[PDB]
C-alpha cells in the first residue's frame, strides 16, 4: 500500500538502475515478457510497492528514465529486461550535456525538466500514500549530475513531507573517469546536503576491490558489478515489501541514523558474498555473518573505519534465524569494537530481521553505515577543488555559460563547513 | 508400485506448489465468477472450473493457477488409472479405487467435500467461502491424497 | 381489502421502482410471471391466477422504459400501466410544466381513475421522484397540482432524490430543486428524502463494496420502502397505517420534510461477526455515519422519529433501548416534544434478494425522522440559487417555454420563508 | 420517434460525413449493402434514430449531401459505403463556389438549396416528431460555409421550435489552407451566433499533433484524422440509440451547458486514447480516464485551457462501470482545480452514462465544454480581419457582387462586441 | 469425448448468440405468421419453421435468424450421430439418445416443450404469445442442451 | 432426398396453382361430361380423364388445364416410385406405400375420397358437383399430399 517512484537518470544511473529492476523481478519471478510466473503467493501479497497494474496480469515497473543522450536508452530498451518499462516515462533529449554541470542546470536540461515534472506527476497522482522517490544517479557524469541535482531541488520545493533516497556513485581518486568530475562533485554535493534526506555514497574502487579480492572473478564486466550493487537497494526496502518478525520502513531508518541535517551520508554494503571454492567449506550461521558485516573488506567504499568513527550503523538481516544470536553477536562486537563507536551514543546498532530469503540463498544481510570516514573523502574532494580553483582552470566551459564564480566559492565554503562540523562531533 | 509411488511423490510436490499458490487459485476463482456473473451458483465441478477458465479468465496468473489445478487433477486421474493398471486389487482396494474414480470424476458434485485435520486447506479460506463457495474445490486435494496413500498402504499390505 | 397506489415519475423513479417491486415479488413468494408456484395489499389479481400490480410508471424518454418492456420482469407489470412519453423534459421545469407536462397528464389521470375504480378501498399515494430530474420535477409538480384537485383528503407521501451538497449529475439542478420545493411545499403532506453522496459513503464502509452502481443504490433505497409499507402488507403486534405516520411526523403545514436512516447496512461477512441485538440495531440508527442523508445532527435538533421494526423483535428491549437512547445528553431535543417517539412492530422479517450484497438479518429497523439538521442542508442550496440569479444565468429557456421570469423572484421569497420557519422552530 | 437528420456540405464536410458514417454503421453493425448483421437485439431497437426502414430488410441512411462542385460526391459514391447511401439524396450544382463566401450565398446559393429543400422537408415531415439537426460544414471553404450557412438560416426558419447542432471546422495559423480564412470564417461565424443553438468547433492543427503524440500514428492520412473526429461525434448521441443508466440527449446537453443564447461555442475531446504500442501497457479505469479527460493534449482545437475559465463542462460517458467513480472524480477536479472553473455557477460538471460501449473497446469517454479561453479563437479572426480590411485587401470581389462594405463593418463590430462577452465574465 | 465436448461448446456458443439475438427470432416468427396468415395454427414443428423461412420470410435478418435456428438443429442432429459414433451403449445413454433424436426430428410436436432454470427465455419473452406458438421454439433449444449436458455427465461417469 | 424435397416444393406450388385454377377445372369436367354424354358416371377415374382429354377436348384452355392435372398425376406417380424404393419397411410404412400406389394407379376408382379439415377445396364448389360429380377428383390431390406429409412425419420419426 506504500509506494516508491524510482527515478532513473544518467548513463551510470541507467545502467545501475537497469540491474536494480532486474533483481526485484528475479526475487519476485517476472519474465522479460511481463507474464507473471511467481511460484508463491508471498510476492503477490505485497507487489504494489514497486510495480503498477495493467489489464491482463501485466505488472509494469514504476520507473522514470530520463537522459540527454539517446544512445543509452536504446541499449536500455534492448537490454534483457528493457522490454517492460514505461515508454511514456522515457523522455530522451538529443544533446548530451558533455559532463558539464551548468549544461544540466541552465542551458539544455533546464528546458527538459518541465516535461520531466509532468511525467513524475503522472506516476505520483496514481497513489494515495507514497513514501517518496528513490532516484538512482551518479555524481561523475554531468548529464546525470547537472540535471539530477536540479531534480532533488525541484521536488523538495514541490513535496516537503516525503522521503528522498538517492543512490549516487561518488567520485573516486584512482578510477577518476572525468577531468572535470571534481567540479561535478562540488557543484552537486552542494545540493545533496541541503535538500536530501537519504544519500548513499557508493565508491567503485571497493566494488573493484570486492570482485578482485573476495570473489576473484576472472571476467566480471558491468553486468556483474551492477548485480552486487542492485542487491543493496532491495535491502533498503527488504522490510518494506517482505513482512516478517520485525518490520521497518524507510523513514524508520532515516530518522534513526540521522542526528542532524549535516550527517546523512550512508556507506552501503551487502553481506553473503562468498568465494566460489568455499561454499561447501563455509558453515551458514549468524556468527559466520558477524565477522562478515563488520569486515572492513566488504564495504562498498574505499574507506577505512580505521580512519573514522561510527555514529549510527544499520544492518538488516534477511532469512529464517533466531533473535538470540543476532543480539548476542552484536553484544560481542559492541563490546570489543567499542573504540570505533563514539562513547556518547549507546545501542549503536539497529537490527531488523526479515524472514523471506533471496532465491538461491537461504539467508542474506544488508549493510548501512554512517561513519566519519566520509569526511576525508569529501576533504580530498575539497583540496583538489581548491587547487583547481586556485588556477581558475577549466572555467571557460562554466563561466562561458552565464553562471558566475560566486557559486564556486560558496560551495567551497559549504564543502569544508560540512566536514568541519563533522570534526566537532568526532 | 514403484512408478505409482514416484507419481504420488510428484503429486505431493505439485500439491505443495498449489498450496503455495493457493490464494492465487482463490483469486482466479473469484475473478472467473465475477466475469461470468455466477455469483449465486457455486462452482461444483472441475469441468466447471475448466469452463470458467476457458471463457471468463483474462488474467495471466489466474489462467496459470487454473491450468496448474487442472493439470494436478489430470495427474491424479492418471495415477488413479495407473493403480488399476499396476495392481490387481482387493475388494477394499476396489472400493477405494471406485471412490477415487468418483471423486476425480469431472461431472461429480464436489460441494459436499470438506477436509479435516491436519489439512488446514479449509482454514486457508473464509467460513462462507468454505461452506458454500469454494470449500470442496479447495479441499479436494487432501481427501484424494489420503485416499491414494491408503490405497498404497493397502497394496503394500497385500501378501506375495 | 385495503389497497395502496405507488406512482413513480421520471427515470429516477424507474430504476428505483424496478427494484422496489423486485423485492415485493421476492417477499411474498411470487414468480416473475405473477403467479405463485396478503398479496392483495399492493398487487391486484386476475381470475386466471395472474397478478397485475396496482402501480404506474411514467417517463418521457423511452429507452429507460424500454428496459422494462423486455426485461426479466416483463410479464410482471401491465402493458398500459407503463405510459410511454415522446421526448425528455431535459432538466427544465418549464418544459415539464407548460408544454410536456400538459400532454400526458390527462392520460395519467385517466389510468389512475381506472385503477381507482378497481380500488374499493385505497389508503394513499406513495410518490417517487427526483428534485434534479427533468420529468420527476416538472411532471410530478402539476400532477400533484391535479391529483389534489381531484382527490380531497387522501393520503400523500413523497420520496425524493434530494441534492447532495458535493456530488452532482446536473448543473441547472438548483433551478429544478427550487421550482420543486415551491409547488410541493403547498400540497405535499410529507417528503422523505435521500441523497447519493450518503449512499456512496454508506456503500463503501458498510457493505465493503469498492465499486457501487445505482443498482446497489436501488437495492438499499428499495428495501427502505419495503420496510416502510410492510405493516399494511403483513400483520403484526402493532401495525402502522399510512394515515398514521403522516400525522405523527408533521408539526406544521409547512414543516413537512423528514429524513430516513437505515440499519443494519451490513454485509455478509461483517454480520457473521457482529451480533444483531435489539439495542445494536437501533443504536446504529442514531450514529451519524449510518445517516441516509449527508447532514450532521450536531447543529440539528430532532422533532419526531417514526420507527418501524420487522422480524423477531421482542417489544421489551424496544423500549429499553429507546430509554437508553434518551439518556445521553449529546442527542439534542427541543423542549416541546418530550414524548415524541413512535414504535411500529411487524411480524415478517425482511428477506434478501438472490445474490444480495446486504446480510440476511433476523431483525431490522427503519427510522423516518424529521429534524432541524436539514436547515443547514438548504443553507447552502439557497445561496446557490441566489448566486446564479445575480448574474441571471440559464433564464432564457425558462421564459420562452411558458413560465414567468417573476416566478424566479416569487419562489425565492417562499424559500426564505421556509428557512425562517426552521429557525423559530429550532430555537 | 425523436429524430435527427444529418447534413453535409462542401468538400470538407462530405469527407468527414463519409467517415462519420463509417463508425455509426459499425456500432450498429451494418454491412455496406444495407442489411443488418449484428449480434445484439439492442442495436435493432433504436436503429431508426439515424436510419429509415426499407423493404427487403434494407436500411437507407438519411443524410442530405450537398455540393456545388461535383468532384467530392463522386468520391462519396466511390467510398466504402458509396453503395448504401440514397441516390436521390445527392444534390449537385453546376459551378462550385470556389472558396468564396460571396459566391456560395447570394449568387450561386438559391439555385441549389430549393432543390435541396425538396429533399429535407420530405425526410423531416416523414417522421412523427423530429429531434434536431446535425450538420458538418467548414469555415474555410466557401461552398461549405456560405451555402451551409444559408441552409442553417432557412431550415431554422422552417422549423423554429427545434434545436440545431453544428460541428464546424475552425482554422489554425500554421495549417493555413485558404487565403480568405480571415474573410470566410468572419463571414460565417457572424451568422452562426444569431441563428444556431449549438456550435462545435474542431481545429485541424492539434489533430496533426494528436496522431503523433497520443496514438503515435506513423502515416496519418485524412482517414485517420476524420476517424477521431467521426467517433467523437458518435458519442454525443450515444444515448439516443442505446440505453443508459443516466440517459441524456443533445438538448439535455444544451440546458445544462449554455448560460446565454449568444455564448454557445464549445470544444470537444475524445479520450480512451492509448497508443498502439501501449495496449498491454495501460489500465482502463476512471482514474486514468479523468486524468486523460482534462489534459491539454486531448482537446480538438488549437487552444489552451489556462488562458480562461471553463464556464460549464459536460460529458457523455459510455461503458459499464461504477456510478460513484464519475460522481467522485468529477468532484475533486472541481476541488483541486478550483480556479480553472467559474465561481458564479455552482456544480459546473454535467455527467451522463450510456450502456453500450463501441466494438473493439471496453470503456469510452467524451468531452464537450465551453471555456472563456475561446476568445483567442475569435479575437485572432478579429485582428486578422482588421489586418485584411485596413489595406483594403481582397475587397474587389465583394464590391461587384452586390455586397456592401457596411456589411463587413457590421460583421466586424458585432463580433468585436461579442469577444468582450467572453472577456467580461472572465473578470 | 473431447470432440463431443468441442461440438457441445460450439453449440453452446451459438445458442448464447441466439439467446442474445432472441428478439429478432420472435420478430421473424411474427413476420412469417403475418405473411402466411395462419394465426389460428400455432408454430409447433421445425418443418413449419423451415417452411415459414422459405416462403413467409423476406427480411434478411429474419432469414439469418431462421438459418441460425436451422443450423442449431443440424448441429444437434450431427452431435446425436457423433455420440453414437463415440459411445457403445448404456441404458440411460440409449434412452437419452432416443429422446434427443425424437426432439431433433423436424416433425417433433414442440408445443409440450417447456424449459426450466436457468433458461429464462420464457420470462424474457411474453408467455401469452409463447404459450400460443413461440414457447416450443423458445424451449426446444434449452431442454436439448440440458439433455446433452446430462448425456455428457453420463459419458463422463462411464 | 434433396431431389425429393425440391419435388415436394414443386408439387406444393403446382397444387396451389391447381387450387387457384379450381373453378375452371370444374367447368372443364362439366363440358367434358356434356360431350361424352356420361352424366350418370361420377368422374373419379384417371383413365376416364385420359380418354376425355384425348377425345372430348375442344378448347386450348381446357387442353392446358387437363395437361396440368395429368402432369400432377404423373409426377406424383414418379414420386411414389421413388418412395417405394427409398425406405426399408414397417407395417405402417407398407400401408402408406400401398395406399399411395393404390391411389395413384389409374385402375382404381377414387370416388371414396373426401378431404378433411386442412384442405377446404371441397366447400368451394356447388352442392351436387362437390358431393357426387367431381368430389373424388377434387379430393384426390389432398389425399395424396396428406400421405406425403404423413410419410415425411413418419420418416422423420423413425430412428435409423
Ligand atoms: N440514487 C439513485 N439516483 C438515481 C437513480 N436513477 C436516477 N437517479 C437520479 O436521477 C437524477 C437524474 O435526473 P433524471 O432522473 O435522469 O431526470 P428525469 O426526471 O427522469 O427527467 P429526464 O432526464 O428528462 O428523463 C440524478 O440525480 C440521479 O442521481 C438511481 O437508481 N439511484
Ligand atoms: N557502478 C557502475 N558505474 C558505472 C557504470 N557505467 C558507468 N559508470 C560510471 O559512470 C561514470 C560516468 O558517468 P556518466 O555515465 O557519464 O553519467 P552521464 O553524464 O549522466 O551519462 C564513470 O565514472 C563510470 O565509472 C556501471 O555499469 N556501473
Ligand atoms: N479534418 C479534416 N479536414 C478537412 C478534410 N477535408 C478538408 N478539410 C479541411 O477543409 C478546408 C478546406 O475546405 P474546402 O474544400 O475548401 O471546402 P469547400 O470549398 O466549401 O468545399 C481545409 O482547411 C482542410 O483542412 C478532412 O477529411 N478532414
Ligand atoms: Mg431523466
Amino acid at each position: 500500500m506504500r509506494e516508491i517512484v524510482h527515478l532513473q537518470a544518467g548513463q551510470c544511473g541507467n545502467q545501475i538502475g537497469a540491474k536494480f529492476w532486474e533483481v526485484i523481478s528475479d526475487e519476485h519471478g517476472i519474465d522479460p515478457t511481463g507474464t507473471y510466473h511467481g511460484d508463491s503467493d508471498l510476492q503477490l501479497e505485497r507487489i504494489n510497492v514497486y510495480y503498477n497494474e495493467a489489464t491482463g496480469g501485466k505488472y509494469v515497473p514504476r520507473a522514470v528514465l530520463v537522459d540527454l543522450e539517446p544512445g543509452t536508452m536504446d541499449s536500455v530498451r534492448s537490454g534483457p529486461f528493457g522490454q517492460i518499462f514505461r515508454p511514456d516515462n522515457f523522455v530522451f533529449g538529443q544533446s548530451g550535456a558533455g559532463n558539464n554541470w551548468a549544461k544540466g542546470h541552465y542551458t539544455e536540461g533546464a528546458e527538459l525538466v518541465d516535461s520531466v515534472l509532468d511525467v513524475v506527476r503522472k506516476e505520483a497522482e496514481s497513489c494515495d500514500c507514497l513514501q517518496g522517490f528513490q532516484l538512482t544517479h551518479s555524481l561523475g557524469g554531468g548529464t546525470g549530475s547537472g540535471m539530477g541535482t536540479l531534480l532533488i531541488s525541484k521536488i523538495r520545493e514541490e513535496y516537503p513531507d516525503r522521503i528522498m533516497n538517492t543512490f549516487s556513485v561518488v567520485p573516486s581518486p584512482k578510477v577518476s573517469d572525468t577531468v572535470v568530475e571534481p567540479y561535478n562533485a562540488t557543484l552537486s554535493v552542494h545540493q545533496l546536503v541541503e535538500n536530501t534526506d537519504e544519500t548513499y555514497c557508493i565508491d567503485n574502487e571497493a566494488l573493484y576491490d570486492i570482485c578482485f579480492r573476495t570473489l576473484k572473478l576472472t571476467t566480471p564486466t558491468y553486468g556483474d558489478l551492477n548485480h552486487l550493487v542492485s542487491a543493496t537497494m532491495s535491502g533498503v526496502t527488504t522490510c518494506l515489501r517482505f513482512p516478517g518478525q520485525l518490520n521497518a520502513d524507510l523513514r524508520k531508518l532515516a530518522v534513526n541514523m540521522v542526528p542532524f541535517p549535516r550527517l546523512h551520508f550512508f556507506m552501503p554494503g551487502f553481506a553473503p558474498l562468498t568465494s566460489r571454492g568455499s561454499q561447501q567449506y563455509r558453515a551458514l550461521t549468524v556468527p559466520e555473518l558477524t565477522q562478515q558485516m563488520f569486515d572492513a573488506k566488504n564495504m562498498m567504499a574505499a574507506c577505512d573505519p580505521r580512519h573514522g568513527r561510527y555514529l549510527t550503523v544499520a544492518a538488516v538481516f534477511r532469512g529464517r534465524m533466531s533473535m538470540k544470536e543476532v543480539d548476542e553477536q552484536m553484544l560481542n562486537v559492541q563490546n570489543k569494537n567499542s573504540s570505533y563507536f563514539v562513547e556518547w551514543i549507546p545501542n549503536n546498532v539497529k537490527t531488523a530481521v526479515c524472514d523471506i530469503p533471496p532465491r538461491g540463498l537461504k539467508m542474506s544481510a544488508t549493510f548501512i553505515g554512517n561513519s566519519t570516514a566520509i569526511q576525508e573523502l569529501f576533504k580530498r574532494i575539497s583540496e583538489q577543488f581548491t587547487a583547481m580553483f586556485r588556477r581558475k582552470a577549466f572555467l571557460h566551459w562554466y563561466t562561458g555559460e552565464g553562471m558566475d564564480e560566486m557559486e564556486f566559492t560558496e560551495a567551497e565554503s559549504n564543502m569544508n563547513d560540512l566536514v568541519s562540523e563533522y570534526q566537532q562531533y568526532q | 508400485m514403484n512408478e505409482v509411488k514416484e507419481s504420488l511423490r510428484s503429486i505431493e510436490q505439485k500439491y505443495k506448489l498449489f498450496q503455495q499458490q493457493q490464494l492465487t487459485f482463490t483469486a482466479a476463482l473469484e475473478h472467473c465468477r465475477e466475469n461470468a456473473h455466477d455469483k449465486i451458483r457455486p462452482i461444483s465441478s472441475i469441468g466447471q472450473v475448466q469452463s470458467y477458465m476457458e471463457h471468463y479468465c483474462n488474467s495471466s496468473t489466474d489462467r496459470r493457477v487454473l491450468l496448474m489445478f487442472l493439470d494436478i487433477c489430470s495427474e491424479l486421474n492418471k495415477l488413479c488409472q495407473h493403480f488399476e493398471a499396476v495392481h490387481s486389487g482387493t475388494p477394499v482396494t476396489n472400493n477405494l479405487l471406485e471412490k477415487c474414480k468418483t471423486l476425480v470424476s469431472q461431472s461429480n458434485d464436489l460441494s459436499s467435500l470438506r477436509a479435516k485435520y491436519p489439512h488446514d486447506v479449509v482454514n486457508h479460506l473464509s467460513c462462507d467461502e468454505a461452506r458454500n463457495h469454494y470449500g470442496g474445490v479447495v479441499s479436494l486435494i487432501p481427501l484424494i491424497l489420503d485416499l491414494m496413500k491408503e490405497w498404497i498402504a493397502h497394496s503394500e499390505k497385500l501378501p506375495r | 381489502m385495503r389497497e395502496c397506489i405507488s406512482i413513480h415519475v421520471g427515470q429516477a423513479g424507474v430504476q428505483i421502482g424496478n427494484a422496489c417491486w423486485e423485492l415485493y415479488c421476492l417477499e411474498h413468494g411470487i414468480q416473475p410471471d405473477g403467479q405463485m408456484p396478503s398479496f392483495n395489499t399492493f398487487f391486484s389479481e386476475t381470475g386466471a391466477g395472474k397478478h397485475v400490480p396496482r402501480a404506474v410508471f411514467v417517463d418521457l424518454e423511452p429507452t429507460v422504459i424500454d428496459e422494462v418492456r423486455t426485461g426479466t420482469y416483463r410479464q410482471l407489470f401491465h402493458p398500459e400501466q407503463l405510459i410511454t412519453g415522446k421526448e425528455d423534459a431535459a432538466n427544465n421545469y418549464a418544459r415539464g410544466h407548460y408544454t410536456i407536462g400538459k400532454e400526458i397528464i390527462d392520460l395519467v389521470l385517466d389510468r389512475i381513475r381506472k385503477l381507482a375504480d378497481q380500488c374499493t378501498g385505497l389508503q394513499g399515494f406513495l410518490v417517487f421522484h427526483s428534485f434534479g430530474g427533468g420529468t420527476g420535477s416538472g411532471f410530478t409538480s402539476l400532477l400533484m397540482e391535479r391529483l389534489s384537485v381531484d382527490y380531497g383528503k387522501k393520503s400523500k407521501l413523497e420520496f425524493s432524490i434530494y441534492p447532495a451538497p458535493q456530488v452532482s449529475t446536473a448543473v441547472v439542478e438548483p433551478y429544478n430543486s427550487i421550482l420543486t420545493t415551491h409547488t410541493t411545499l403547498e400540497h405535499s403532506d410529507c417528503a422523505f428524502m435521500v441523497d447519493n453522496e450518503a449512499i456512496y459513503d454508506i456503500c463503501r464502509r458498510n457493505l465493503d463494496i469498492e465499486r457501487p452502481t445505482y443498482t446497489n443504490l436501488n437495492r438499499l433505497i428499495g428495501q427502505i420502502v419495503s420496510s416502510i409499507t410492510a405493516s399494511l402488507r403483513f400483520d403484526g403486534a402493532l401495525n402502522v397505517d399510512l394515515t398514521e405516520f403522516q400525522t405523527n411526523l408533521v408539526p406544521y403545514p409547512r414543516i413537512h420534510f423528514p429524513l430516513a436512516t437505515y440499519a443494519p447496512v451490513i454485509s455478509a461477512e461483517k454480520a457473521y461477526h457482529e451480533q444483531l441485538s435489539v439495542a445494536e440495531i437501533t443504536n446504529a440508527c442514531f450514529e451519524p455515519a449510518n445517516q441516509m442523508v449527508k447532514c450532521d445532527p450536531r447543529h440539528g435538533k430532532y422533532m419526531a422519529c417514526c420507527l418501524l421494526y420487522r422480524g423477531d423483535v421482542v417489544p421489551k428491549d424496544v423500549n429499553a433501548a429507546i430509554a437508553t437512547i434518551k439518556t445521553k445528553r449529546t442527542i439534542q431535543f427541543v423542549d416541546w416534544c418530550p414524548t415524541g417517539f413512535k414504535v411500529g412492530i411487524n411480524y415478517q422479517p425482511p428477506t434478501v434478494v438472490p445474490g444480495g450484497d446486504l446480510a440476511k438479518v433476523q431483525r431490522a429497523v427503519c427510522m423516518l425522522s424529521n429534524t432541524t439538521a436539514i436547515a443547514e442542508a438548504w443553507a447552502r442550496l439557497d445561496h446557490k440559487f441566489d448566486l446564479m440569479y445575480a448574474k441571471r444565468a440559464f433564464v432564457h429557456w425558462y421564459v420562452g417555454e411558458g413560465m414567468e421570469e417573476g416566478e424566479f423572484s416569487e419562489a425565492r421569497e417562499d424559500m426564505a420563508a421556509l428557512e425562517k420557519d426552521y429557525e423559530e422552530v429550532g430555537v
Side-chain angles (χ1 to χ4, degrees), chain C residues 11 15 61-64 66-67 70 85-88 90-92 95 134 164-174 197 200-201 204 210-215 384 387-388 391-397:
Chain C
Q11 68 96 31
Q15 292 97 21
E61 190 276 331
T63 193
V64 61
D66 284 331
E67 183 178 1
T70 61
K86 275 192 171 184
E87 183 178 1
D88 56 355
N91 278 7
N92 197 312
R95 184 92 191 241
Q166 285 90 21
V167 299
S168 169
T169 71
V171 183
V172 293
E173 154 180 332
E197 203 176 352
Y200 316 136
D201 291 331
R204 184 179 67 189
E210 183 178 1
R211 277 185 252 277
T213 187
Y214 291 167
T215 290
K384 291 174 70 175
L387 201 66
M388 294 182 286
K391 286 204 167 302
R392 301 256 305 277
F394 302 115
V395 177
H396 77 94
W397 301 296

Side-chain angles (χ1 to χ4, degrees), chain A residues 141-159:
Chain A
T143 303
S145 176
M147 185 179 288
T149 56
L150 188 149
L151 306 183
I152 297 90
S153 85
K154 272 194 174 293
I155 297 169
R156 154 84 68 177
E157 278 215 22
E158 294 293 328
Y159 305 138

Side-chain angles (χ1 to χ4, degrees), chain A residues 174-319:
Chain A
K174 280 73 176 175
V175 193
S176 62
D177 291 331
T178 300
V179 188
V180 291
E181 186 179 4
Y183 291 166
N184 297 329
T186 306
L187 273 297
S188 62
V189 179
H190 181 266
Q191 287 70 240
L192 284 184
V193 176
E194 184 191 1
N195 297 115
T196 316
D197 288 332
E198 287 199 346
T199 309
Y200 281 70
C201 312
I202 303 170
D203 201 356
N204 63 7
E205 301 146 291
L207 294 174
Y208 271 96
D209 280 340
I210 280 169
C211 295
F212 168 57
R213 294 191 292 171
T214 306
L215 276 294
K216 296 177 183 179
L217 295 177
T218 62
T219 50
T221 61
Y222 291 169
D224 270 1
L225 277 77
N226 289 348
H227 184 198
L228 282 72
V229 176
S230 51
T232 300
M233 283 74 74
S234 185
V236 179
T237 63
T238 187
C239 294
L240 183 63
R241 323 150 288 155
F242 302 102
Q245 285 156 335
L246 183 63
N247 304 292
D249 68 331
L250 294 174
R251 184 141 70 121
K252 176 103 157 189
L253 277 296
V255 169
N256 192 347
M257 283 75 75
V258 175
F260 296 96
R262 270 144 290 192
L263 288 164
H264 63 87
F265 291 94
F266 301 119
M267 177 178 328
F270 194 50
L273 286 32
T274 304
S275 59
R276 183 68 68 192
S278 66
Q279 287 84 229
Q280 49 194 354
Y281 305 99
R282 192 190 267 208
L284 292 175
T285 61
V286 176
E288 190 276 331
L289 294 174
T290 300
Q291 159 255 308
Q292 197 145 314
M293 283 74 74
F294 280 160
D295 192 351
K297 297 169 72 173
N298 290 318
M299 64 183 73
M300 278 157 177
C303 296
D304 289 343
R306 269 63 57 95
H307 305 147
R309 288 178 87 92
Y310 292 165
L311 296 164
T312 46
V313 64
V316 298
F317 288 82
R318 173 170 184 199

Side-chain angles (χ1 to χ4, degrees), chain C residues 41-64:
Chain C
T41 53
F42 267 102
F43 304 91
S44 182
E45 65 183 1
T46 314
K50 206 189 190 298
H51 292 79
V52 178
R54 286 173 202 118
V56 291
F57 291 165
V58 193
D59 201 320
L60 272 300
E61 190 276 331
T63 193
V64 61

Side-chain angles (χ1 to χ4, degrees), chain C residues 309-346:
Chain C
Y309 298 177
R310 287 160 80 195
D312 183 76
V313 60
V314 75
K316 183 178 184 293
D317 313 286
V318 178
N319 313 116
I322 297 169
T324 300
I325 279 170
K326 291 174 81 78
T327 44
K328 277 74 69 177
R329 318 168 186 176
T330 318
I331 297 89
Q332 278 205 16
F333 262 83
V334 298
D335 58 356
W336 46 281
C337 186
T339 47
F341 282 78
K342 180 68 174 66
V343 171
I345 305 298
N346 290 319

Side-chain angles (χ1 to χ4, degrees), chain C residues 9-13 15-16 59 61 88-91 130 132-137 161 169 173 196 199 214-215 217-218 221:
Chain C
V9 190
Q11 68 96 31
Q15 292 97 21
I16 290 172
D59 201 320
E61 190 276 331
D88 56 355
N91 278 7
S130 61
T135 301
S137 287
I161 309 301
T169 71
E173 154 180 332
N196 306 281
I199 322 170
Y214 291 167
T215 290
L217 282 71
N218 283 157
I221 295 177

